[PDB]
Design a protein around this ligand. Structure first.
Ligand code: HEC
Ligand code: HEC
Ligand code: NI
Lengths: 106, 106
């Protein structure tokens, strides 16, 4: 899917995690976030269209998703050990990373 | 140093990074910040003084500094590599993580 679709998937599953009742629910939402981040990592954002595909700004954009995926993996590790509160807390650590990419590339 | 002093160091050295013009200064301030964060991690904050150190909240508090330290290291790598503007921008994005912890425990 394209970038706005994947961002909607990111945003909607954050709320699913916030309201989750067990760690397996958090797990399911996080795996869907993980796939959406990796799919978005293949897009070219508008504010970098007129830029070389190999530009350092393109690689910083792509590495922003690598960082986010690492944090999603960190939260998945807690969710798969049944720690619903702790994986929920880890998922809200994502929000600042969301905003840091937006500040430069949205 | 006590918790409040370490916060003073983090707050004042963020502004030092803002006004610096060369990597040597950025490195110096990021280094003071990194030690202050690791020192603050060992404290018990007043809004948690009647919890136990193994309480979730006390572990969430600790984990916030682990995460902040890693992002300081990322900015130190940029200033060791001599990219002053990028390191200054990485340091500005620390504020979101400051605020996230503050909204819970400040
Ligand atoms: C870069 C590394 C990003 C990260 C990490 C996240 N997002 Fe993002 N987001 C990014 C761009 C470039 C854009 C604009 C894309 C465009 O073509 O307009 C966005 C946009 C959003 C939006 C608005 C959706 C829309 O239809 O325009 C939302 C709601 C959004 N992003 C949410 C979001 C969340 C919750 C993130 C982390 C969990 C996140 N984004 C990360 C780039 C990047
Ligand atoms: C938790 C993981 C925190 C992180 C990360 C940061 N801060 Fe912090 N801050 C925290 C607490 C619990 C408190 C209250 C301490 C107390 O004893 O009252 C604070 C306080 C501050 C203050 C005000 C200090 C004072 O005047 O008493 C400042 C200016 C401040 N913090 C700055 C700051 C900055 C710039 C941070 C990121 C670089 C940062 N803090 C991170 C908890 C946490
Ligand atoms: Ni991070």
């Amino acid at each position: 899917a394209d970038l706005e679709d994947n961002m909607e998937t990111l945003n909607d599953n954050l709320k699913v995690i916030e309201k989750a009742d067990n760690a397996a629910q958090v797990k399911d939402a996080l795996t869907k976030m993980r796939a959406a981040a990796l799919d978005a990592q293949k897009a070219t954002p508008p504010k970098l269209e007129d830029k070389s595909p190999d530009s350092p700004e393109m690689w910083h954009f792509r590495h922003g998703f690598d960082h986010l995926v690492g944090h999603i993996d960190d939260a998945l590790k807690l969710a798969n050990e049944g720690k619903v509160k702790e994986a929920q807390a880890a998922a809200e650590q994502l929000k600042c990373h969301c905003n840091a990419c937006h500040q430069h590339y949205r």
